[PDB]
Ligand binder design. Structure first.
Ligand SMILES: Nc1ncnc2c1ncn2[C@@H]1O[C@H](CSCC[C@H](N)C(=O)O)[C@@H](O)[C@H]1O
Ligand SMILES: CNc1cc(C)c(C(N)=O)c[n+]1C
Length: 254
């Protein structure tokens, strides 16, 4: 009774997803602001840095990487959907048909103290992203046959509830992402709480409805130690999903 992963290849419209959730012109904008403040805190205020960050289930979005590119030499973006990766690549290659992230970029520049302007920030992100890869979090080797050095950080925003049909798969996915991480490496997860679906227009997608206790327990079971865990009550618009807030966590691999 859960969305099949092949539905992501064919029925997840990347430009419609961006239009629906990331236009930043709403509950969606309030959530985006909070996600950005947390990412800024992690990568710029806390010591989350290194040579390599792997972003898991990036979809067609870059917002989750804007603060990260200040702290990581290389960012690898990954997703199950080739269509999502193509939409991402349109922005990376600064193509005229690319999504306009400029209000989000400006917001991050403001958070970071206006040290740089939008164009410099976008260029820094474009230079950090060297690889755009296929991933499947449900597999023991999420990146398949593709070899990568162990990462300093694995980040995943709004992916794991959508990718995991049940709690045992969710715990296994956390172990699978851990295989990409160096010992003592950072795991950064942000996702919806108690959400059983989300919509992109008329297209419905399943979500695993987890509470904060189940998320914490799965992260400890998967071999991590939690540094901090935050719950926000703000939910997406009623037309989009049925979540009861969002969580953010930073953990280290044992
Ligand atoms: N098994 C799986 N492994 C990896 N990615 C998967 C997956 N099942 C679904 N996904 C991806 O999970 C994403 C959910 S959308 C979240 C996109 C983005 N990180 C954001 O913050 O908005 C989609 O891009 C979808 O292709
Ligand atoms: C904004 N993107 C969202 C939003 C929600 C609420 C869910 C979910 N897990 O229900 C998944 N995605 C990918």
């Amino acid at each position: 009774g859960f969305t099949s992963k092949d539905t992501y290849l064919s029925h997840f419209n990347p430009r419609d997803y961006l239009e629906k959730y990331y236009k930043f012109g709403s509950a969606e904008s309030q959530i985006l602001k909070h996600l950005l403040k947390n990412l800024f805190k992690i990568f710029c205020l806390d010591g989350v840095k290194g040579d390599l960050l792997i972003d898991i289930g990036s979809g067609p979005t870059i917002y989750q990487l804007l603060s990260a590119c200040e702290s990581f030499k290389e960012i690898v973006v990954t997703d199950y959907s080739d269509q999502n990766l193509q939409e991402l690549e349109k922005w990376l290659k600064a193509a005229p048909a690319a999504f306009d992230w400029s209000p989000v970029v400006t917001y991050v520049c403001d958070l970071e103290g206006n040290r740089v302007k939008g164009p410099e920030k976008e260029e820094k992100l474009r230079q950090a992203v060297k690889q755009v890869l296929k991933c499947d979090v449900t597999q023991s080797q999420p990146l398949g046959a593709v070899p990568l050095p162990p990462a300093d950080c694995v980040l995943s925003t709004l992916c794991l509830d959508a990718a995991c049909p049940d709690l045992p798969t969710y715990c296994r996915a956390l172990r699978n992402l851990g295989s990409l991480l160096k010992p003592g490496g950072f795991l950064v997860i942000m996702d919806a709480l108690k959400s059983s679906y989300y919509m992109i227009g008329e297209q419905k997608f399943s979500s695993l409805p987890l509470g904060r206790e189940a998320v914490e327990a799965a992260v400890k079971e998967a071999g991590y130690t939690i540094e901090w865990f935050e719950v926000i009550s703000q939910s997406y618009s009623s037309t989009m999903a049925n979540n009861e807030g969002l969580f953010s966590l930073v953990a280290r691999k044992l």
